[PDB]
């Protein structure tokens, strides 16, 4: 209901079906103007960009997507380590926007199923 | 004493739990204290 913690309850112990969707980020403007869709879920080999933030409007990709954590590693947002290893580094995917959507087998038929 | 059958693995369970507090605990918290309440000491508590 109207509740902070008890609304977050559903988000926290969300099933794996809902955790597909809750790996969310918006779509870019020429993806909306191509299709129609608001957001679509976020996966590994998508080209990404940072919306709100100091990392402002830079090019990136995603390295890893994680299931329970929700947070994704972002390629090109790269710092080192104390030992000196150039790693992709974490961000929560709300701070991101994807520029790639693939066509594939029948994601082609997902986005244009019965409603679309 | 002479031990029976179903005493032995209750005692084995107790001496297995005589190991330290799990080290996974303060990877979730990081540093901040989480203290626990069981194990067994030899001088003090016996088993059930």
């Amino acid at each position: 209901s109207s509740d902070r913690r008890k609304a977050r309850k559903a988000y926290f112990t969300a099933p794996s079906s809902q955790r597909r969707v809750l790996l969310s980020a918006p779509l870019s403007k020429e993806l909306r103007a191509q299709y129609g869709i608001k957001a679509l879920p976020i996966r590994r080999d998508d080209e990404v960009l940072v919306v709100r933030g100091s990392k402002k409007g830079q090019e990136g990709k995603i390295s890893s997507v994680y299931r329970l954590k929700f947070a994704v590693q972002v390629d090109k947002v790269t710092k080192e380590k104390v030992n000196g290893a150039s790693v992709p580094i974490n961000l929560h995917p709300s701070k991101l926007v994807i520029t790639k959507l693939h066509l594939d087998k029948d994601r082609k038929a997902l986005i244009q199923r019965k409603g679309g | 004493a002479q031990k029976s059958f179903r005493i032995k693995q209750k005692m084995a369970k107790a001496k297995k739990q005589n190991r330290p507090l799990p080290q996974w605990i303060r990877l979730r918290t990081n540093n901040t204290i989480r203290y626990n309440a069981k194990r067994r000491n030899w001088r003090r508590t016996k088993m059930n």
Binding site: - | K8, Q9, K13, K16
Partner: protein, 80 residues
Amino acid sequence: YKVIEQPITSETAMKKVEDGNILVFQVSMKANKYQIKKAVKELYEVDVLKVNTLVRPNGTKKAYVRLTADYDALDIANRI
């Protein structure tokens, strides 16, 4: 339940196979003296005399697998 898990192959089983004959085993718990001996006899390929039992405070029952004279000891233990 069922009888045999595996041998226990620490440095202790490398004492009592060179000198004192046996293969030290760590089987299941309700696996008695008769059951363990004939189960070794079919499985491993060795003839077996008195096989003994002892449970530690770890809960697991050991078995003391004594062999016959025509068979070996070292080429009985190290086959796996």
